[PDB]
Design a protein around this ligand. Structure first.
Ligand SMILES: [Cl-]
Ligand SMILES: [Cl-]
Ligand SMILES: [Cl-]
Length: 129
């Protein structure tokens, strides 16, 4: 599913991501924009052989099981395929664990490089939330 901008903001809020660990909704929408362009089915293969999955490009080295990342963990206790669903519940619940891991949203390199320090409120501007 490719979400609309406000549609995704609303879904993220419904799932308790808004201001989670102090990160406003615009931060999460911005991260999703640059990680997946709001596409739940996004996948990308990393140089180390791990894969990133879903709207927030969650990585199989630590967070989910895909059966093809040697030496990896599955800390969210989910198949990576769950992160591709039109229902963002699994992605949100896993993101909550990731952002609580110590480095906040810096865990998403694209958030650090493209969202951090910017006017992230622009991502939820106009949205009925
Ligand atoms: Cl915001
Ligand atoms: Cl594996
Ligand atoms: Cl980047």
């Amino acid at each position: 599913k490719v979400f609309g901008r406000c549609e995704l903001a609303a879904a993220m809020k419904r799932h308790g991501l808004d201001n989670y660990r102090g990160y406003s909704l615009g931060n999460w929408v911005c991260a999703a924009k640059f990680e997946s362009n709001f596409n739940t089915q996004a996948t990308n293969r990393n140089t180390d052989g791990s894969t990133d999955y879903g709207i927030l490009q969650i990585n199989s080295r630590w967070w989910c099981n895909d059966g093809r990342t040697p030496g990896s963990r599955n800390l969210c206790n989910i198949p990576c395929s769950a992160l591709l669903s039109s229902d963002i519940t699994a992605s949100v619940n896993c993101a909550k664990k990731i952002v609580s891991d110590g480095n906040g949203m810096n865990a998403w390199v694209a958030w650090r490089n493209r969202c951090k320090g910017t006017d992230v409120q622009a991502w939820i501007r106009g949205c009925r939330l």
